[PDB]
Amino acid sequence: TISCTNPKQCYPHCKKETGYPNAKCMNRKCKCFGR
Numbered sequence: 001t002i003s004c005t006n007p008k009q010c011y012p013h014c015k016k017e018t019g020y021p022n023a024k025c026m027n028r029k030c031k032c033f034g035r
Contacts, residue, residue, distance in 0.1 A: 003028050010030040011023055014032040017032070018034050018035060019034075020032055
């Protein structure tokens with residue numbers, strides 16, 4: 001798990017991890033659109 005206080009961080013990180021950049025972020029959490 002990574003630490004992201006904003007979606008702009010999991011946006012690009014997931015844009016390559018799973019290809020889907022659409023990723024949300026929560027209290028020190030990340031919910032991509034297809035983990």
